[PDB]
């Protein structure tokens, strides 16, 4: 067969493509306005919504007809979205090309590897999931110098769309679960994995859904405000921007480190702790946000907690319901993050504008993270289902 570490590289490739898709709009804000920032951000909001919703059908189709078809279709759709975003002329044009097509393909690329990589690593599920999701923290590090090299804009859309289509087709080409019988390794009761209908009907699934929505919303609601908070406190734009930039490093690193850490010690308490820490960070920025060092610390903590969500929620869902229906279960679960990605940033901006001050959005995010802390800490796994219909066999 093939080594079980190959799916990790595949998910790295696919998630890196998705990260390039998500990082594109920030590089395009200035060039596109050259020919309103909020008008541009509407395309990104559409992209987030489409992405986060298309995970659900992507997960169902991955569970039904395998993940290769889904990821490669996603690569086609995204590549089309980017290459067509390159040939745009109107606002709605970019909305469709980037937000819808590219977002569609991006969701279809993102989900199947998150579902597949743990299947090869039953001994290290959270780490493998982290490899399936760590590419999104990379999009900035690879694209930003690349995008600057191309511009210093349509060239970015076209060539990046080609490269992303290629990486996604490579990742999806070699992507498939292990064979049904044997699992890569080095009268009784027979348990079994939950069905998608059994998981979707479970109450803890929606407690996790609610926690996910809250965490994603709070993070997306304040991250855009971190550097503006620093400038309001008295820092120079350069200093505040430098301070907030460490959030990318922590957001990327946490996806692998938290995965490995909970593989070793368990999910629930570390996860709840990270949420608590995010709560404290939303509150603490008011004391630490006015100096490069303090603002950097808050950005790192926000990045760590936020990023950890995207390993720990799929790892938690895998713990609860098992991996056979993980495509459907986590695809459904991720739509929470899709909705938050649509609405959260706008709400943060609106609250700040409404009051003129940062207390309201940060305090609202702290409340959401408190709720998430409570849910994540108090939710223990459900009863492992038994296959009585398979149990009967031991005479
Ligand atoms: C952003 C917050 C969104 C919270 C959504 C909570 C949904 C709770 C009600 O849903 C229903 O729950 C049943 C089992 O509990 C399922 O059988 C059913 O399919 C589902 O429709």
XYZ file of C-alpha atoms and ligand atoms in Angstrom:
416
model
C 0.000 0.000 0.000
C 1.107 3.573 0.774
C 2.527 5.055 3.985
C 0.014 6.554 6.374
C 1.917 9.860 6.464
C 1.017 10.627 2.825
C -2.548 11.728 3.791
C -0.941 14.249 6.155
C 0.987 15.818 3.285
C -2.170 15.746 1.169
C -4.210 17.591 3.808
C -1.321 20.009 4.206
C -1.475 20.731 0.461
C -5.271 21.074 0.364
C -5.508 23.220 3.486
C -2.670 25.392 2.149
C -4.679 25.961 -1.031
C -7.680 26.936 1.132
C -5.445 29.297 3.094
C -4.311 30.966 -0.128
C -7.981 31.415 -1.079
C -8.779 33.040 2.279
C -5.649 35.279 2.334
C -6.253 36.552 -1.216
C -8.784 39.275 -0.365
C -6.395 41.125 1.964
C -3.790 41.382 -0.807
C -6.519 42.498 -3.208
C -8.075 45.227 -0.993
C -5.686 47.966 -2.148
C -5.404 47.039 -5.883
C -9.144 46.523 -6.397
C -10.003 49.870 -4.793
C -7.374 51.438 -7.054
C -9.706 50.841 -10.048
C -14.786 50.801 -1.197
C -13.069 48.531 1.332
C -16.433 47.361 2.728
C -17.656 46.681 -0.816
C -14.611 44.435 -1.291
C -15.063 42.768 2.107
C -18.530 41.719 0.970
C -16.839 39.312 -1.468
C -14.815 37.811 1.372
C -17.938 37.447 3.530
C -19.687 35.660 0.667
C -16.631 33.425 0.286
C -16.645 32.509 3.978
C -20.359 31.750 3.896
C -20.111 29.583 0.770
C -17.024 27.768 2.083
C -18.498 27.018 5.501
C -21.790 25.855 4.035
C -20.289 23.766 1.216
C -18.373 21.697 3.744
C -21.696 19.940 4.633
C -22.452 18.682 1.080
C -18.720 18.032 0.644
C -18.788 15.850 3.743
C -21.884 13.930 2.695
C -20.446 13.321 -0.777
C -17.066 12.299 0.652
C -18.792 9.764 2.919
C -20.925 8.449 0.041
C -18.682 8.344 -3.060
C -15.242 8.798 -1.497
C -13.149 11.923 -0.861
C -11.081 11.985 -4.064
C -14.018 13.010 -6.266
C -14.999 15.749 -3.803
C -11.527 17.285 -3.417
C -10.785 17.202 -7.145
C -14.151 18.767 -8.011
C -13.324 21.391 -5.392
C -9.976 22.012 -7.039
C -11.728 22.503 -10.376
C -14.312 24.853 -8.883
C -11.743 26.898 -6.947
C -9.309 27.118 -9.859
C -12.207 28.302 -12.017
C -13.175 30.775 -9.308
C -9.686 32.272 -9.074
C -8.992 32.315 -12.815
C -12.406 33.936 -13.411
C -11.840 36.361 -10.529
C -8.832 37.436 -12.557
C -11.008 38.475 -15.541
C -13.544 40.507 -13.524
C -15.015 43.932 -14.333
C -17.890 44.539 -11.856
C -18.595 44.105 -8.159
C -21.073 41.234 -8.544
C -18.604 39.575 -10.919
C -16.030 39.211 -8.162
C -18.775 38.261 -5.686
C -19.602 35.289 -7.905
C -16.123 34.269 -9.092
C -14.293 34.580 -5.763
C -17.049 34.402 -3.159
C -19.216 31.671 -4.677
C -17.237 29.509 -7.150
C -13.876 29.803 -5.428
C -15.513 29.481 -1.998
C -17.455 26.432 -3.180
C -14.354 24.657 -4.418
C -12.523 25.720 -1.273
C -15.031 24.102 1.068
C -14.993 20.939 -1.023
C -11.185 20.887 -0.785
C -11.103 21.684 2.930
C -13.411 19.069 4.401
C -12.575 15.586 2.967
C -8.923 15.607 4.137
C -9.958 16.634 7.658
C -12.214 13.581 7.611
C -9.618 11.264 6.006
C -6.234 12.004 7.642
C -7.309 10.710 11.110
C -8.555 7.449 9.572
C -4.898 6.698 8.840
C -3.827 7.741 12.353
C -6.135 6.059 14.889
C -3.236 6.349 17.352
C -2.866 10.104 16.647
C -6.214 11.449 15.428
C -5.904 15.056 16.602
C -2.406 15.394 15.136
C -3.523 14.052 11.735
C -6.522 16.385 11.799
C -4.109 19.203 12.566
C -2.166 18.304 9.443
C -5.426 18.377 7.517
C -6.111 21.923 8.787
C -2.661 23.482 9.219
C -2.453 24.684 5.626
C -4.829 27.562 6.360
C -2.307 29.092 8.730
C 0.240 28.900 5.911
C -1.635 30.836 3.213
C -0.174 34.148 4.360
C 3.418 32.910 4.672
C 3.477 31.474 1.145
C 1.187 33.881 -0.704
C 2.221 37.268 0.702
C 5.769 37.332 -0.663
C 4.459 35.576 -3.790
C 1.616 38.072 -4.251
C 3.973 41.007 -3.653
C 6.408 39.519 -6.187
C 3.579 39.328 -8.757
C 2.227 42.830 -8.159
C 5.055 44.992 -6.814
C -3.255 42.269 -9.530
C -5.104 40.138 -12.071
C -1.857 38.171 -12.426
C -2.205 37.108 -8.783
C -5.754 35.844 -9.360
C -4.829 33.892 -12.512
C -1.481 32.356 -11.546
C -2.566 31.678 -7.969
C -5.742 30.049 -9.275
C -3.674 27.788 -11.512
C -1.259 26.873 -8.701
C -4.127 26.266 -6.262
C -6.015 24.095 -8.729
C -2.810 22.110 -9.220
C -2.075 21.650 -5.510
C -5.712 20.720 -4.819
C -5.827 18.190 -7.647
C -2.575 16.660 -6.359
C -3.910 16.480 -2.804
C -7.202 14.949 -3.940
C -5.566 12.607 -6.458
C -3.771 10.520 -3.825
C -6.551 10.845 -1.230
C -8.652 7.887 -0.066
C -9.403 6.156 3.283
C -7.636 2.924 4.295
C -9.103 -0.325 2.936
C -12.216 -1.448 4.775
C -10.802 -4.510 6.515
C -7.303 -3.868 7.806
C -6.099 -0.814 9.685
C -2.450 0.381 9.589
C -0.728 -0.844 12.746
C 2.820 -1.673 13.756
C -19.752 -13.414 24.827
C -18.393 -9.900 24.160
C -19.923 -6.489 23.457
C -19.454 -5.024 19.965
C -19.535 -1.234 19.804
C -19.852 0.829 16.622
C -19.594 4.349 15.272
C -22.595 6.630 15.239
C -24.535 7.153 12.045
C -24.885 10.647 10.618
C -28.592 10.520 11.502
C -27.727 9.375 15.036
C -25.094 12.089 15.472
C -27.175 14.851 13.850
C -29.994 13.915 16.206
C -27.748 14.002 19.278
C -27.972 16.955 21.656
C -24.247 17.123 22.414
C -23.576 17.593 18.699
C -25.507 20.850 18.875
C -23.883 21.905 22.151
C -20.616 21.581 20.223
C -22.208 23.396 17.284
C -23.187 26.253 19.589
C -19.736 26.374 21.154
C -18.182 26.413 17.723
C -20.379 29.247 16.546
C -19.579 31.268 19.667
C -15.840 30.807 19.459
C -15.603 31.473 15.721
C -17.845 34.534 16.029
C -15.881 36.074 18.915
C -12.504 35.565 17.265
C -13.604 36.836 13.846
C -15.398 39.721 15.580
C -12.266 41.111 17.284
C -9.197 40.047 15.245
C -9.704 42.845 12.731
C -9.910 45.253 15.673
C -6.636 44.249 17.376
C -4.383 46.613 15.386
C -6.900 49.448 15.483
C -7.027 49.062 19.262
C -3.254 49.410 19.348
C -3.331 52.562 17.217
C -6.066 54.063 19.417
C -3.960 53.372 22.516
C -1.171 55.536 21.080
C 1.023 53.147 19.099
C 2.266 53.852 15.607
C 0.575 51.900 12.814
C 3.860 50.081 12.144
C 4.232 49.013 15.783
C 0.621 47.889 16.198
C 0.765 45.952 12.918
C 4.001 44.229 13.922
C 2.460 43.318 17.267
C -0.671 41.781 15.732
C 1.348 39.855 13.114
C 2.439 37.224 15.672
C -1.181 36.040 15.680
C -0.458 34.255 12.382
C 2.452 32.277 13.865
C 0.419 31.161 16.862
C -2.699 30.428 14.776
C -0.655 28.139 12.515
C 1.433 26.446 15.246
C -1.522 25.691 17.530
C -3.186 23.512 14.897
C -0.374 20.959 15.130
C 0.687 21.447 18.743
C -2.809 21.289 20.278
C -3.520 18.241 18.151
C -0.449 16.457 19.480
C -1.080 17.680 23.032
C -4.660 16.372 23.212
C -3.601 13.165 21.480
C -1.395 12.713 24.526
C -3.624 14.038 27.403
C -7.198 14.239 26.120
C -9.315 16.994 24.627
C -11.959 18.303 26.981
C -10.000 20.116 29.699
C -7.293 21.593 27.453
C -10.031 22.723 25.037
C -12.086 24.318 27.816
C -8.926 25.956 29.133
C -8.126 27.521 25.752
C -11.654 28.949 25.609
C -11.240 30.368 29.121
C -7.941 31.870 28.040
C -9.640 33.477 25.043
C -12.246 34.934 27.404
C -9.503 36.404 29.592
C -7.749 37.741 26.483
C -10.829 39.630 25.278
C -10.926 41.217 28.719
C -7.160 41.688 29.105
C -6.527 43.579 25.886
C -7.844 46.628 27.754
C -4.885 46.408 30.131
C -2.218 45.065 27.738
C -3.242 46.506 24.365
C -1.374 49.820 24.568
C 2.214 48.555 24.227
C 3.819 46.469 21.488
C 4.744 43.728 23.972
C 1.314 43.502 25.604
C -0.581 43.754 22.327
C 1.656 41.012 20.887
C 0.869 38.749 23.862
C -2.878 39.199 23.379
C -2.574 38.577 19.630
C -0.584 35.379 20.240
C -3.116 34.105 22.770
C -6.066 34.971 20.502
C -4.300 33.233 17.629
C -3.493 30.149 19.723
C -7.057 29.685 20.983
C -8.759 30.504 17.677
C -6.532 28.182 15.657
C -6.845 25.366 18.188
C -10.605 25.334 17.567
C -10.114 23.899 14.062
C -8.202 20.869 15.336
C -10.064 20.315 18.609
C -13.650 20.514 17.345
C -13.022 17.886 14.627
C -11.035 15.825 17.155
C -13.880 16.192 19.677
C -16.504 15.193 17.097
C -14.303 12.218 16.139
C -14.110 11.185 19.801
C -17.894 11.416 20.200
C -19.205 9.776 17.030
C -16.274 7.915 15.509
C -14.613 8.271 12.117
C -16.862 6.288 9.744
C -19.464 9.094 9.599
C -16.927 11.843 10.363
C -17.272 13.394 6.903
C -20.989 14.065 7.417
C -20.748 14.843 11.144
C -17.947 17.398 10.862
C -19.241 18.861 7.585
C -22.510 19.636 9.341
C -20.640 20.952 12.403
C -18.457 23.329 10.368
C -21.425 25.272 8.962
C -21.435 27.026 12.340
C -18.043 28.407 11.436
C -19.424 29.304 8.019
C -22.185 31.436 9.543
C -19.790 33.106 11.973
C -17.378 33.801 9.121
C -20.199 35.551 7.314
C -21.553 37.719 10.098
C -18.933 38.167 12.840
C -16.576 40.767 11.324
C -19.463 42.974 10.245
C -21.015 42.831 13.728
C -17.715 43.779 15.333
C -17.364 46.777 13.044
C -20.983 47.775 13.635
C -20.719 47.603 17.428
C -17.519 49.648 17.402
C -19.072 52.271 15.119
C -22.334 52.318 17.115
C -20.551 53.127 20.378
C -17.356 54.610 18.942
C -15.389 52.425 21.392
C -13.874 48.927 21.624
C -15.501 47.903 24.923
C -18.658 46.522 23.303
C -17.205 44.113 20.678
C -14.496 42.792 22.998
C -16.958 42.372 25.870
C -19.435 40.592 23.590
C -16.660 38.270 22.377
C -15.689 37.622 25.996
C -19.287 36.611 26.742
C -19.392 34.266 23.750
C -16.095 32.674 24.804
C -17.375 32.295 28.375
C -20.398 30.423 27.025
C -18.119 28.299 24.862
C -15.920 27.559 27.883
C -18.955 26.342 29.812
C -20.280 24.165 26.986
C -16.912 22.620 26.104
C -16.058 21.877 29.740
C -19.449 20.423 30.728
C -19.923 18.256 27.593
C -18.592 14.700 28.032
C -18.910 12.100 25.247
C -22.192 10.232 24.694
C -22.741 6.505 25.212
C -20.883 4.378 22.684
C -23.432 2.664 20.459
C -23.564 -1.127 20.424
C -24.259 -3.187 17.298
C -26.690 -5.712 18.764
C -27.248 -6.775 15.149
C -23.515 -7.572 15.016
C -23.380 -8.741 18.644
C -25.783 -11.638 17.958
C -22.994 -13.436 16.058
C -21.188 -14.767 19.083
C -23.971 -17.276 19.242
C -26.247 29.535 15.979
C -27.084 28.672 16.947
C -27.766 27.485 16.201
C -28.340 26.451 17.213
C -29.118 25.312 16.466
C -29.732 24.321 17.486
C -30.671 23.303 16.775
C -31.488 22.558 17.845
C -32.763 21.996 17.160
O -32.365 21.287 16.003
C -32.870 20.026 15.883
O -32.355 19.158 16.981
C -32.814 17.767 16.919
C -32.140 16.976 18.014
O -31.813 17.800 19.098
C -32.591 17.132 15.533
O -33.254 15.862 15.505
C -33.018 18.002 14.377
O -32.517 17.462 13.111
C -32.636 19.440 14.493
O -33.378 20.235 13.552
